[PDB]
């Protein structure tokens, strides 16, 4: 039978690998796989996961740096776990009578047992459906998969998806957040504060949480509530900078509300990521370029991250009815690629693009995008036109290392200042100028005159993000072929503490952080106050 | 060197030292603490010392037929302009078309 | 003498590349002719339709200024693909702005604005149309859009009813805006 032949082939492969390790010579895996499969008479080849899932323990520890699969999953310095909430209705269904004109799925739809703005056939959607929307099971399952691939899960970040999370009853939000923290740490708590304490003392660090919210649910109350949870990032859907579009699609709010929410969130200390949608109705091929030029040149709009979602028409929505009646037509594919190239050429060097298109399966789409690799096609077109993309994602060491083959040689220090949302922003970085390679970054902001938090009033400057890229280095370990634990963090904080005292004129510095970061900043010399890590500068 | 000179820049990107043209793709220049700073169409910034230099040496540097060595030439963005120079801290301030700053 | 009009002429406009000429008659009519003064079309300015650039929705969810001399204004885009005409509508009694394309077909009509002035100047780069407005306690320079909607403004440093704006005109490379003011 093929099964025992497969097993013997696998065992022989690990035997050769461990022998070669013992006498200490390098070995090529593909040739060994083919040769060993030839002997036992097979019609297939071994899979990497199978070879990983049969190593003895000590050898399992020693020889993972050769059998790892999908090296992109931890090429940015963290491990990402995505979880989903319970199905529910969007808050503006009541006082308007209906929801956005293009959103698919939801509690009242033909997509059975699916969350709003999702179909249920997606990877994460099918993971939570079989788990019946339980945060503990989802976290455990995803961490098990990540460990089975062969990655290190020392540092974790959560992403909470679904509809509007902050519109649910308080008890459910308590349940969800405390279960996430307990799943990481291993405790069995009763409320948020107990879970937060135990997670602070944990060994599997929780770097931060990300939540998606609407501009009318981002006020002082909601911001404070999210501050107690441990959240550090926000996702808001702007979709357009034009006031007529925001009311012809039954969005439910206005652009001025979006700007005010941006101002409050940035003064409180969060990070802002914006969803934008090209090819909206009543928006031609010339208003998109102006839209994005204003987006990146007007101080009221400048965000920290972007998500480009070209418009898709899906069955069971108002836009579907518009499309059937012969009143709405999509762009041609060449025009779409050209537009995306032009848009990507405008992104400033301090902005990071996380995703470039949706992930709806192709057969469910009636019109719109049909391919599945828009980003790389756009990059090739940009190379043809002679322009270049200079965002954050396509300039860091891991991406430059796996897509191209380059390494930093002549690292230098760079600083960029600007004005945004009524505040004076600075962006410090360590990067290689000649090859255009990014290593580590830090964001700093001087608090404006309209801050409401008690801890930040009276002359406080706040640090909003500190990050060093590369592959993941486990805590208290060192790897001379990677970039993390080599002192680029205490160099970036010493400079932030000099700007905040000699230029801002402040007398205190505050940091928003997770929990493992709490221990790190305690090591540096900061103390704890409220949900912040503060330090006197006098 | 040991002689005064008159430096001139036109709006068609031409650089003159005395009566002799020495470069043809310049967009900005400055002189601060016995140092000359230039920005080119090729998206490069250049810094020359003036304490020990001559017309021939400067022309040779800006000869458009010189292989670059990494002490004088540095790469920048597109459409950068020199705002000012801080020699006491060894810094150079630049402005970009969209409006931000850079040091 | 290569042309003649029974009624008087009010304005004459030439394209940025001289291949098309626009004439406005005293009978509220606009004639578009070619370079060789061979008539191409003639149309009445005071129409009653928005155009073909409509607004599609699914349905889910006061007088002209006293110092206005009622002259029409005609402006061309930088590349010559569109043009705009400002005129005092007899129906509403206020100023109205229409935008046409090069093949002389109506594109758009401006939204109702209270206090609109007589000036008009399309940005040569082709992004915004400049005008003027007088509102309670301030005088503003407002910016139109090809769609016919307002998209920005800035404030002049003068008190109410102290000056008047005679003309607006842009620069060659669209960097400087020149404003002409006369004291009342
Ligand atoms: C605060 C926030 O918003 S999050 C920080 C970013 N989140 C991440 O963890 C992603 C990647 N982060 C990193 O690169 C690091 O964790 C940073 C940014 C915190 C520090 O970057 P580095 O340049 O690696 O720090 P640096 O080399 O100066 O410090 C190394 C020391 O920090 C320790 N350390 C690193 N991360 C942590 C942590 N989460 N908790 C406790 N100690 C930590 C290391 O064990 C090492 O201590 P030791 O060698 O003396 O035993
Ligand atoms: C989850 C995000 O998905 C985007 N989104 C919602 N509906 C559509 C659609 N039909 N096509 C493309 N993107 C869409 C919105 O930007 C929302 O914020
Ligand atoms: C999941 S959709 C994006 C979040 C939120 N519903 C919004 O529209 O802004
Ligand atoms: S708010 Fe977001 S999730 Fe809710 S209907 Fe609108 S687009 Fe969909």
PDB file of C-alpha atoms in Angstrom, chain C residues 58-165:
ATOM      1  CA  UNK C  58     -30.803  53.952  -5.924  1.00  0.00           C
ATOM      2  CA  UNK C  59     -33.188  55.827  -3.611  1.00  0.00           C
ATOM      3  CA  UNK C  60     -32.397  53.887  -0.428  1.00  0.00           C
ATOM      4  CA  UNK C  61     -31.297  57.078   1.324  1.00  0.00           C
ATOM      5  CA  UNK C  62     -31.335  85.351  -3.730  1.00  0.00           C
ATOM      6  CA  UNK C  63     -30.777  88.047  -6.355  1.00  0.00           C
ATOM      7  CA  UNK C  64     -27.805  89.259  -8.360  1.00  0.00           C
ATOM      8  CA  UNK C  65     -25.548  91.860  -6.787  1.00  0.00           C
ATOM      9  CA  UNK C  66     -26.348  95.548  -7.412  1.00  0.00           C
ATOM     10  CA  UNK C  67     -23.003  96.238  -9.139  1.00  0.00           C
ATOM     11  CA  UNK C  68     -23.434  93.401 -11.663  1.00  0.00           C
ATOM     12  CA  UNK C  69     -23.336  94.532 -15.298  1.00  0.00           C
ATOM     13  CA  UNK C  70     -24.933  91.293 -16.602  1.00  0.00           C
ATOM     14  CA  UNK C  71     -22.209  90.497 -19.118  1.00  0.00           C
ATOM     15  CA  UNK C  72     -21.554  86.847 -20.000  1.00  0.00           C
ATOM     16  CA  UNK C  73     -18.213  85.230 -19.240  1.00  0.00           C
ATOM     17  CA  UNK C  74     -16.536  82.484 -21.282  1.00  0.00           C
ATOM     18  CA  UNK C  75     -13.515  80.447 -20.192  1.00  0.00           C
ATOM     19  CA  UNK C  76     -11.513  77.579 -21.709  1.00  0.00           C
ATOM     20  CA  UNK C  77      -9.604  74.761 -20.060  1.00  0.00           C
ATOM     21  CA  UNK C  78      -5.851  74.505 -20.520  1.00  0.00           C
ATOM     22  CA  UNK C  79      -5.972  71.669 -23.056  1.00  0.00           C
ATOM     23  CA  UNK C  80      -9.119  72.917 -24.799  1.00  0.00           C
ATOM     24  CA  UNK C  81     -11.275  69.866 -24.064  1.00  0.00           C
ATOM     25  CA  UNK C  82     -14.012  71.809 -22.233  1.00  0.00           C
ATOM     26  CA  UNK C  83     -15.283  75.317 -21.635  1.00  0.00           C
ATOM     27  CA  UNK C  84     -17.609  77.147 -19.262  1.00  0.00           C
ATOM     28  CA  UNK C  85     -20.075  80.030 -19.562  1.00  0.00           C
ATOM     29  CA  UNK C  86     -21.427  82.223 -16.753  1.00  0.00           C
ATOM     30  CA  UNK C  87     -24.592  84.253 -17.320  1.00  0.00           C
ATOM     31  CA  UNK C  88     -27.427  85.860 -15.359  1.00  0.00           C
ATOM     32  CA  UNK C  89     -30.468  83.610 -15.606  1.00  0.00           C
ATOM     33  CA  UNK C  90     -33.767  85.501 -15.999  1.00  0.00           C
ATOM     34  CA  UNK C  91     -35.763  82.769 -14.236  1.00  0.00           C
ATOM     35  CA  UNK C  92     -33.965  82.685 -10.885  1.00  0.00           C
ATOM     36  CA  UNK C  93     -32.547  86.184 -11.269  1.00  0.00           C
ATOM     37  CA  UNK C  94     -29.094  85.053 -10.104  1.00  0.00           C
ATOM     38  CA  UNK C  95     -25.847  83.972 -11.764  1.00  0.00           C
ATOM     39  CA  UNK C  96     -25.594  80.504 -13.296  1.00  0.00           C
ATOM     40  CA  UNK C  97     -22.635  78.534 -14.649  1.00  0.00           C
ATOM     41  CA  UNK C  98     -22.816  75.936 -17.421  1.00  0.00           C
ATOM     42  CA  UNK C  99     -20.061  73.630 -18.679  1.00  0.00           C
ATOM     43  CA  UNK C 100     -19.853  72.354 -22.277  1.00  0.00           C
ATOM     44  CA  UNK C 101     -17.436  69.996 -24.012  1.00  0.00           C
ATOM     45  CA  UNK C 102     -15.461  70.659 -27.191  1.00  0.00           C
ATOM     46  CA  UNK C 103     -18.005  69.068 -29.560  1.00  0.00           C
ATOM     47  CA  UNK C 104     -20.478  71.673 -28.249  1.00  0.00           C
ATOM     48  CA  UNK C 105     -22.732  69.444 -26.156  1.00  0.00           C
ATOM     49  CA  UNK C 106     -24.054  70.446 -22.742  1.00  0.00           C
ATOM     50  CA  UNK C 107     -22.337  68.741 -19.810  1.00  0.00           C
ATOM     51  CA  UNK C 108     -23.308  70.292 -16.491  1.00  0.00           C
ATOM     52  CA  UNK C 109     -25.084  73.110 -14.659  1.00  0.00           C
ATOM     53  CA  UNK C 110     -23.922  74.633 -11.385  1.00  0.00           C
ATOM     54  CA  UNK C 111     -25.838  74.243  -8.141  1.00  0.00           C
ATOM     55  CA  UNK C 112     -27.742  77.218  -6.665  1.00  0.00           C
ATOM     56  CA  UNK C 113     -25.383  79.521  -4.755  1.00  0.00           C
ATOM     57  CA  UNK C 114     -26.548  82.640  -2.909  1.00  0.00           C
ATOM     58  CA  UNK C 115     -24.477  85.731  -3.655  1.00  0.00           C
ATOM     59  CA  UNK C 116     -22.435  84.523  -6.632  1.00  0.00           C
ATOM     60  CA  UNK C 117     -20.395  87.194  -8.380  1.00  0.00           C
ATOM     61  CA  UNK C 118     -19.635  87.774 -12.065  1.00  0.00           C
ATOM     62  CA  UNK C 119     -16.005  86.606 -12.213  1.00  0.00           C
ATOM     63  CA  UNK C 120     -14.807  83.290 -13.647  1.00  0.00           C
ATOM     64  CA  UNK C 121     -11.411  81.745 -14.448  1.00  0.00           C
ATOM     65  CA  UNK C 122     -10.628  78.090 -15.151  1.00  0.00           C
ATOM     66  CA  UNK C 123      -7.345  76.839 -13.733  1.00  0.00           C
ATOM     67  CA  UNK C 124      -4.950  76.152 -16.642  1.00  0.00           C
ATOM     68  CA  UNK C 125      -3.931  72.815 -15.138  1.00  0.00           C
ATOM     69  CA  UNK C 126      -7.630  71.963 -15.238  1.00  0.00           C
ATOM     70  CA  UNK C 127      -8.730  71.133 -11.706  1.00  0.00           C
ATOM     71  CA  UNK C 128     -10.782  74.011 -10.269  1.00  0.00           C
ATOM     72  CA  UNK C 129     -12.911  76.897 -11.534  1.00  0.00           C
ATOM     73  CA  UNK C 130     -12.559  80.116  -9.543  1.00  0.00           C
ATOM     74  CA  UNK C 131     -15.351  82.570  -8.746  1.00  0.00           C
ATOM     75  CA  UNK C 132     -16.385  84.901  -5.920  1.00  0.00           C
ATOM     76  CA  UNK C 133     -19.092  85.007  -3.255  1.00  0.00           C
ATOM     77  CA  UNK C 134     -20.416  87.611  -0.813  1.00  0.00           C
ATOM     78  CA  UNK C 135     -21.943  86.089   2.316  1.00  0.00           C
ATOM     79  CA  UNK C 136     -23.094  87.571   5.656  1.00  0.00           C
ATOM     80  CA  UNK C 137     -20.047  89.201   7.323  1.00  0.00           C
ATOM     81  CA  UNK C 138     -17.457  88.073   4.754  1.00  0.00           C
ATOM     82  CA  UNK C 139     -16.325  87.923   1.140  1.00  0.00           C
ATOM     83  CA  UNK C 140     -14.909  84.635  -0.121  1.00  0.00           C
ATOM     84  CA  UNK C 141     -13.134  83.295  -3.174  1.00  0.00           C
ATOM     85  CA  UNK C 142     -14.847  79.992  -3.952  1.00  0.00           C
ATOM     86  CA  UNK C 143     -13.740  77.141  -6.206  1.00  0.00           C
ATOM     87  CA  UNK C 144     -16.116  75.234  -8.456  1.00  0.00           C
ATOM     88  CA  UNK C 145     -15.753  71.768  -9.943  1.00  0.00           C
ATOM     89  CA  UNK C 146     -16.423  70.404 -13.422  1.00  0.00           C
ATOM     90  CA  UNK C 147     -19.356  68.497 -11.916  1.00  0.00           C
ATOM     91  CA  UNK C 148     -20.896  71.801 -10.808  1.00  0.00           C
ATOM     92  CA  UNK C 149     -20.322  71.527  -7.044  1.00  0.00           C
ATOM     93  CA  UNK C 150     -18.434  73.727  -4.598  1.00  0.00           C
ATOM     94  CA  UNK C 151     -15.070  72.357  -3.460  1.00  0.00           C
ATOM     95  CA  UNK C 152     -13.325  74.936  -1.299  1.00  0.00           C
ATOM     96  CA  UNK C 153     -12.856  78.617  -0.472  1.00  0.00           C
ATOM     97  CA  UNK C 154     -10.702  81.219   1.223  1.00  0.00           C
ATOM     98  CA  UNK C 155     -11.393  84.577   2.837  1.00  0.00           C
ATOM     99  CA  UNK C 156     -10.427  88.065   1.676  1.00  0.00           C
ATOM    100  CA  UNK C 157      -9.067  90.458   4.360  1.00  0.00           C
ATOM    101  CA  UNK C 158     -11.784  93.093   4.035  1.00  0.00           C
ATOM    102  CA  UNK C 159     -14.921  94.138   5.883  1.00  0.00           C
ATOM    103  CA  UNK C 160     -18.396  93.733   4.427  1.00  0.00           C
ATOM    104  CA  UNK C 161     -19.418  96.107   1.621  1.00  0.00           C
ATOM    105  CA  UNK C 162     -15.992  97.732   1.334  1.00  0.00           C
ATOM    106  CA  UNK C 163     -14.634  96.439  -2.010  1.00  0.00           C
ATOM    107  CA  UNK C 164     -15.725  94.723  -5.217  1.00  0.00           C
ATOM    108  CA  UNK C 165     -13.970  92.053  -7.274  1.00  0.00           C
TER     109      UNK C 165
END
